Automatic annotation (TrEMBL), chain B:
Entry-linked Gene3D superfamilies: 3.30.1320.10
Protein family membership: Belongs to the bacterial ribosomal protein bS16 family.
Keyword presence, Disulfide bond: no
Family matches, as InterPro entries: Ribosomal_bS16, Ribosomal_bS16_dom_sf
Record organism: Mycoplasmoides pneumoniae (strain ATCC 15531 / DSM 23978 / CIP 103766 / NBRC 14401 / NCTC 10119 / FH)
GO MF: structural constituent of ribosome
GO annotation (BP), single: translation
Protein name: Small ribosomal subunit protein bS16
GO CC annotation terms, alphabetical: cytoplasm; small ribosomal subunit
Gene it is expressed from: rpsP
NCBIfam families to which the protein is assigned, alphabetical: S16
Keywords from the named record: Ribonucleoprotein, Ribosomal protein
Length: 153, 80, 141, 83, 136, 203
RNA sequence: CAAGGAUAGCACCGGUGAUUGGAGUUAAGUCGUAACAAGGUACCCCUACGAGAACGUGGGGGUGGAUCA
RNA sequence: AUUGGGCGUAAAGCAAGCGCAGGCGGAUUGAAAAGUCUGGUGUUAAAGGCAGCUGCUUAACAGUUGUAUGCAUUGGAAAC
RNA sequence: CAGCUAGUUGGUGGGGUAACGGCCUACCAAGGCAAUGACGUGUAGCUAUGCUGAGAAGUAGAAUAGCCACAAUGGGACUG
């Protein structure tokens, strides 16, 4: 419901008798209340690429859970050799992140979280790793049902 | 003095008359602020006895202050 | 009870049990066996009383000349092991010992670490209750 | 008059001179950076008071005394015989 | 790696050579001795004034000066500003920097010094290219 | 700048005002666009999170007539005590003398209050006050040094203003008392204070 | 005992110093086409000889070689 | 890169092997406790870091109230 | 920077220091330290700390405080 751009690039395939220049757009969609997703698109001009990216991201929409407005347990997410390290932020400290990570975390309806990036930063790979790490989230009810004890500790 | 210019300070400090100011010493008896004198001084009233009982009498400028506090009366008990 | 194809002790209790656990949860194997020892018995005891593990048995043929332990894993009808991750902190080349207030906690309290101070291994919450620190050996969650 | 001093336990290694020995002590202590208990061994020269006799390959406990000379700053105080 | 080889071979840090070691070395009389003071600016004397051609992506006619220093090493520098006041044999102020048109020229002759005057006009930039206040 | 001498330009560029709205009185065109000459169809060249964070920072700072280094000093002192620092920054900023002076209905603008205070026209705790950089404490009064009570501006603006709910005053004797801490929902503000908290990375 | 001097030559590190070596920097300099395709003798590695240069060849080794696969 | 990196094709696994020292090691029991865990005691100055308070119009500041790793002796624990 | 060292190493007697001691002396005897880095070379006042970093740590050790060092260079001694 925000649809802010992340990184737009010029790409071109080379073919006999001319190469085709086109625009590639990366988008991320989030209601700020739980439904999040991301997508890529390419087209000859802006409007077609934007529409394609919006449709692709809307199709891949999936929900996410909120733990006291924070990520209550540590997570080290990996995808394409780009480590993302996310840890809980105590409420009353604010949210810190870099641009792409800033947009990702604010778009998911997360209040605050402490983030760090290891490895060579790359937009699409970093987004994939962050989404894989966030979708890996656990929950106290999950550990309760997979354990014998029915309490958090 | 120590502390601040135009706002002096001198801690009541146990030391023997051998070295300079603000250096080696034995105990920290207390402190007096001359910037506001209303017959009051930070004194432990117990450790000063031990300091006096091992020689090293304090700086000469505090005798009236200790008499005001009431340390000389209980210190001269040894020579009684 | 019978198990041919004789097994071999890997190098030590903790590393062997942890690598067996990781390979089992990767291969969804029910039963995993290893060589018996007091430390491994204690580890199996704590990990089965903490609700992360299925039946565990210790057996011998006639003496301690051939004494082994074996254990199963807690699962679900949807083919998902109860455990999800493990990392050993103590290694044969390095053992770190920590005081009370330097006691680590996993996930945020969700995971259980295994700490032995003077009375065998135990859970983190009990060690903090007795305010005894000591050495950790592994994080499981 | 209480008489106390530092005491160290080591293993005697060699002897070539008269009523004097050289003892190797070992100490396993944490590395300053990686906290790995490394072993360091050190040589000390000691003399026999008269109630003792130095034999190579034995565990001894030595105490401080007046410095006899360079490296001679301990005497063989107590021997724990092999059992 | 492993703990034991760390014990026998502790890792050692690497440092990049400073982009101006000449601004850090000085000499003295009464003896010959090289010392390090890592100065931010020094004094020099120009011995050559001329021009040199730049590399591939740009072609121009810049002003470069060979400058000797009171210390040992003697080095090149680039003359900034419109025009110049450097003919030969003048004392001036040398400052660290880098210019990406010539090989090895990593020094700036900062104007507004004991001898060289500046681009009397440049009011947008007056901290550098020493000039007075904007005209009243 | 501590004394800008020109606030209408900032108001037009920022679309905000220290008062409710008095910086557009139809003296010519009443345009809510940016001042100067940059084209009435252009907005900016970079509009990232940095740009809006800076915009809100300048808005909040220029709403109080404070310099940036003193703002950083105030943030450093704020880091001492803990709680909800987002609203605590606002509470501490409003505790400055001129802010409460306006909240007392004494003078419409903080600049006017600073001019009054610096020239020695205010008394507090039987001590002359010449700066508004005073950390006000709960349970403190402020006198008016009755010699200077003859100022026409304060006399005229005492009744024609608005009194904040966290302060009281006996305006007949022109002396006010601090009641309690200010609140976010009682004062006119829409500033994203989180941007202010996050922007300053000096600490 | 003894600083210090004097003589004599041994060790170690520096400054300088005709004049040559090699390297880097320079907008399609000349030479020839060495390598990149089976680069027109398949390529490369170790070592030896020789010539303006590019390297050619001898002995051993590999495919990070083309067709047939 | 202990925290917190690698060694097939990008830098990097020695040409291979025998091995001194070092480092690391099968299971059960005992003993002490060499470290470790855990108390008491004395020692880690003052000033300074950090938290509260106080007088400087007020912040800057200064003073004060405490805090701070490590070391040795001493008693417990014996899982490693 | 592969071996350094000869009062260097140790016993006896004497002298001497404020005391203990090759600290010095007469005789006698020949090891000490080292690959876990002596020895040679280069550099350097150390410490509390300043600064940065969340931290493990890195950097410099200006004020200030404690210690030693020297007082044109090098040797001595009297004084107390
Ligand atoms: C030799 N005939 C070629 C052949 O048909 C090429 N397609 C395989 C064809 O390709 C084109 O049609 C193109 O798309 C672009 C142009 C460069 O050559 C054009 O004409 C190209 C024709 O000239």
């Amino acid at each position: 419901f925000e649809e802010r751009i992340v990184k737009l690039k010029r790409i071109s395939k080379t073919t006999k008798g001319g190469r085709n220049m086109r625009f590639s757009v990366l988008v991320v969609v989030g209601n700020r209340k739980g439904k999040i997703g991301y997508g890529i698109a390419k087209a000859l001009e802006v409007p077609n690429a934007i529409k394609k990216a919006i449709k692709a991201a809307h199709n891949s929409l999936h929900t996410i859970e909120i733990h006291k407005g924070s990520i209550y347990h540590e997570v080290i997410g990996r995808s394409g050799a780009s480590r993302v390290l996310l840890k809980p932020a105590p409420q009353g400290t604010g949210i810190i992140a870099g641009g792409a990570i800033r947009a990702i975390i604010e778009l998911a309806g997360y209040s605050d979280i402490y983030t760090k990036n290891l490895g060579r930063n790359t937009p699409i790979n970093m987004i994939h790793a962050t989404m894989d790490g966030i979708l890996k989230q656990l929950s106290p009810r999950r550990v309760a049902i997979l354990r014998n004890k029915n309490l958090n500790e | 003095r120590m502390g601040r210019v135009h706002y002096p300070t001198y801690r009541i400090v146990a030391v023997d008359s051998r070295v300079k100011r603000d250096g080696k010493y034995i105990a920290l008896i207390g402190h007096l602020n001359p910037a506001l004198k209303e017959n009051k001084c930070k004194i432990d009233e117990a450790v000063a006895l031990e300091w006096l009982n091992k020689g090293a009498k304090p700086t000469d400028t505090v005798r009236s202050l200790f008499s005001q506090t009431g340390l000389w009366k209980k210190f001269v008990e040894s020579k009684k | 009870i019978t198990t041919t194809k004789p097994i071999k002790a890997h190098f030590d209790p903790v590393a062997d049990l942890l690598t067996k656990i990781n390979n089992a949860r990767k291969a969804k194997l029910m039963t995993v066996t290893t060589i018996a020892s007091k430390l491994k018995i204690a580890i199996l005891e704590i990990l089965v009383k903490e609700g992360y593990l299925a039946n565990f048995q210790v057996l011998e043929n006639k003496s301690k000349t051939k004494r082994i332990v074996t254990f199963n894993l807690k699962y679900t009808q949807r083919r998902i092991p109860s455990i999800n991750g493990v990392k050993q902190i103590s290694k044969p080349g390095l053992r770190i010992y920590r005081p009370f207030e330097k006691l680590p906690l996993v996930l945020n309290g969700l995971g259980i670490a295994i700490i032995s101070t003077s009375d065998g291994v135990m859970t983190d919450k009990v060690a903090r209750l007795k305010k005894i620190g000591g050495e950790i050996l592994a994080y499981v969650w | 008059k209480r008489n106390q001093r530092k005491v160290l336990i080591g293993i005697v290694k060699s002897t070539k001179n008269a009523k004097t020995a050289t003892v190797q002590v070992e100490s396993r202590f944490k590395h300053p950076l990686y906290h790995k208990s490394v072993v360091r061994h050190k040589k000390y020269q000691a003399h026999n008071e008269g109630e003792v006799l130095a034999k190579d390959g034995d565990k001894v406990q030595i105490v401080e005394t007046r410095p006899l000379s360079a490296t001679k700053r301990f005497r063989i105080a107590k021997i724990i015989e092999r059992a | 790696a492993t703990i034991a080889q760390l014990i026998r071979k502790p890792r050692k840090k690497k440092k990049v050579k400073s982009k101006s070691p000449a601004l850090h070395y000085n000499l003295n009389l009464l003896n010959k001795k090289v010392t390090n003071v890592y100065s931010p600016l020094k004094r020099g004397v120009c011995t050559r004034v001329g021009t040199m051609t730049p590399k591939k992506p740009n072609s121009a006619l810049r002003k470069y000066a060979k400058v000797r220093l009171t210390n040992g090493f003697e080095v090149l520098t680039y003359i900034p500003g419109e025009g110049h006041n450097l003919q030969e044999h003048s004392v001036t102020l040398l400052r660290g920097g880098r210019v990406k048109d010539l090989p090895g020229v990593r020094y700036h002759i900062v104007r507004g010094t004991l001898d060289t005057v500046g681009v009397e006009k440049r009011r947008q930039q007056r901290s550098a290219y020493g000039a007075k206040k904007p005209k009243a | 700048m501590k004394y800008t001498g020109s606030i209408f330009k900032r108001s037009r560029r920022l679309g905000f005002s220290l008062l409710e709205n008095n910086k557009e009185f139809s003296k010519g065109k009443k345009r809510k666009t940016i001042p100067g000459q940059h084209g009435n169809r252009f907005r900016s060249s970079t509009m990232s999170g940095y740009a809006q964070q800076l915009q809100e920072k300048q808005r909040m700072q220029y709403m109080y007539g404070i310099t940036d280094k003193q703002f950083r000093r105030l943030f450093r002192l704020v880091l001492k005590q803990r709680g909800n620092l987002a609203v605590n920054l606002f509470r501490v900023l409003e505790s400055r003398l001129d802010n409460i002076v306006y909240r007392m209905g004494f003078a419409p603008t903080r600049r006017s209050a600073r001019q009054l205070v610096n020239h020695g026209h205010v008394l507090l705790n039987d001590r002359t006050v010449d700066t508004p950089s005073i950390i006000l404490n709960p349970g403190d009064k402020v006198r008016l040094k009755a010699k200077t009570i003859k100022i026409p501006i304060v006399k005229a603006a005492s009744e024609s203003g608005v009194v904040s709910p966290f302060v009281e005053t006996n305006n007949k004797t022109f002396e006010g008392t601090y009641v309690r801490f200010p609140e976010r929902s009682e004062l006119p503000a829409g500033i994203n204070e989180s941007y202010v908290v996050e922007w300053y990375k000096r600490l």
